[PDB]
Amino acid sequence: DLTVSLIPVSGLKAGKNAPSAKIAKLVVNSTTLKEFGVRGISNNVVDSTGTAWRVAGKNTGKEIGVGLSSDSLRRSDSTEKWNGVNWMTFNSNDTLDIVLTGPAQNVTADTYPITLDVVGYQP
């Protein structure tokens, strides 16, 4: 199996943010498995690979756009299919960046839940 951490990056502020601003770090370790696939989980998945999606604030209901950073996407080993569903795969024993996607976003002060699905893959 895999041991997964999802760690919030500190000192994120409301208002206009930097493009590709870091909001979380995903850590995936295994002693048995060489790779893993990762997808974001939400009501609004905005690309074919579930690597960009939208999350709603708890108190205001406002949406932000979140996903894997460009550099993290580029470190991908492959895009595989599981029951016809696209999963991007990465090397185990590595970390990835979760970021505010696209051009600079104006983030309303709130708490936003971020949920990731991770699975083991053998090439």
């Binding site: 997964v4 002060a109 708490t111 936003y112 699905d117 893959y121």
Partner: peptide
């Protein structure tokens, strides 16, 4: 290659944008 269904984990955290 192939996926390992039993190894699948959902994981979530709260991110906070503060004034």
């Amino acid at each position: 290659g192939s996926f390992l269904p039993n190894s699948e984990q959902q994981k979530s955290v709260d991110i906070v944008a503060s004034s």
